[PDB]
Design a binder for this molecule. Sequence first.
Ligand SMILES: N[C@@H]1[C@@H](O)[C@H](O[C@@H]2O[C@H](CO)[C@@H](O[C@@H]3O[C@H](CO)[C@@H](O[C@@H]4O[C@H](CO)[C@@H](O[C@@H]5O[C@H](CO)[C@@H](O)[C@H](O)[C@H]5N)[C@H](O)[C@H]4N)[C@H](O)[C@H]3N)[C@H](O)[C@H]2N)[C@@H](CO)O[C@H]1O
Ligand code: NAG
Ligand code: NAG
Length: 383
Amino acid sequence: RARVVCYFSNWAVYRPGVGRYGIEDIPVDMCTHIIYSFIGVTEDTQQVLIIDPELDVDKNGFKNFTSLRSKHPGVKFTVAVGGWAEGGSKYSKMVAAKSTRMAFVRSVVDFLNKYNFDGLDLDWEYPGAADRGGSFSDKDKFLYLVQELRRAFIREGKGWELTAAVPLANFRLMEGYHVPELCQELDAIHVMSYDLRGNWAGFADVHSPLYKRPHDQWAYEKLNVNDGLQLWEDKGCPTNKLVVGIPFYGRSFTLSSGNNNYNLGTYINKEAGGGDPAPYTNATGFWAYYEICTEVDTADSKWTKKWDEHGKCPYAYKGTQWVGYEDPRSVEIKMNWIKEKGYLGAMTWAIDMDDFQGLCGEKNILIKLLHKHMSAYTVPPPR
Ligand SMILES: N[C@@H]1[C@@H](O)[C@H](O[C@@H]2O[C@H](CO)[C@@H](O[C@@H]3O[C@H](CO)[C@@H](O[C@@H]4O[C@H](CO)[C@@H](O[C@@H]5O[C@H](CO)[C@@H](O)[C@H](O)[C@H]5N)[C@H](O)[C@H]4N)[C@H](O)[C@H]3N)[C@H](O)[C@H]2N)[C@@H](CO)O[C@H]1O
Ligand SMILES: *[C@@H]1O[C@H](CO)[C@@H](O)[C@H](O)[C@H]1NC(C)=O
Ligand SMILES: *[C@@H]1O[C@H](CO)[C@@H](O)[C@H](O)[C@H]1NC(C)=O
């Protein structure tokens, strides 16, 4: 009764060579809930924005995805609205008034019917965030949107789910999330327990540490998966609504010139923007799990791999390049910890970055760990 929630990226199909990952590559039976990412919202009319219509509509991407339910009827196929690239200002604007929320709600309902989705995942990043076009009143108005969506979904009578992807930093919670009320209205809270460290922070570190490290201070002190999930609990979310995100990717850095200290917390060349882009994701500071294992785990690798003994994550470096990520050891630690805490399950950003080709070993190695642990686990009553 645990969830394995798999975000699926519609842009992964454009990655070259063995990076290409399409609907047909999703290992459906390893997931309980699969979320097509992303649709957005229009700036002017508060309607659903289809972001890649040639793929999503003309080549039937949405429908190919939802019709996977024919062969896998026990799995739920939903769509996520928002995402980082969408920005937050259009969402803050959409929720500002009852009339614009109801326009979006009607548009969402038509869209879910049209493409036979099982519901919607809200991924506005983030209500209340001044750095993302948000403002103080988003906290109330995001909750109104959620309540209004739930009521529309009820009226539609198809039992659609409504979930949200959420951050775990206290200040973000305070600025954007009425926790008890959101947790009551939503079927699952997909906690983004990753991107907790990265080039933006000005030092090298793993991005999904499970527990506090000695160098963690001030805003970073509780910015780890264990304390962040504990914060959601403390703020009133039941244990059996919280799903813990696991990144199938690393945050990388270019170290500062002449820097021979590779320890956690070491200074970086921040203007580099992150580690050099890898060949398939081609994004500074960001490497898919399969881009990491093909470099770090080969027999003749010149990478040095280390282990964060407190955060329970691997990191690896070579020359000026340094990357923190998740590997089978760290993911297994997190699966055991999820079961120890009694949370609703595990989530991944994103299924298209697992080693789905078996370039390094067994295919789909990371999602198989989520599936192995969660499928044998019974979620206990709320704590
Ligand atoms: N919820 C949080 C997530 O949002 C977050 O992960 C991020 O999500 C965002 C979306 O919100 C991702 O943004 C997408 O990034 C894509 C890849 O960079 C962009 O697509 C590409 O854009 C390129 C420019 O046009 C194109 O590059 C070309 O490639 C060609 C192949 O045809 C090549 O021939 C050519 O020479 C190139 N021009 C490419 O075609 C195209 N697909 C997309 O626009 C963009 N919006 C972001 O990547 C992702 N990291 C997550 C992690 O932070 O946390 C989440 O949970
Ligand atoms: C949808 O499936 C059809 C039939 O296999 C295929 O031709 C098309 O490429 C698929 N579209 C996408 C976006 O995966
Ligand atoms: C990789 O992204 C870089 C930097 O954005 C861009 O200049 C280039 O066109 C991309 N290369 C490929 C192969 O997509």
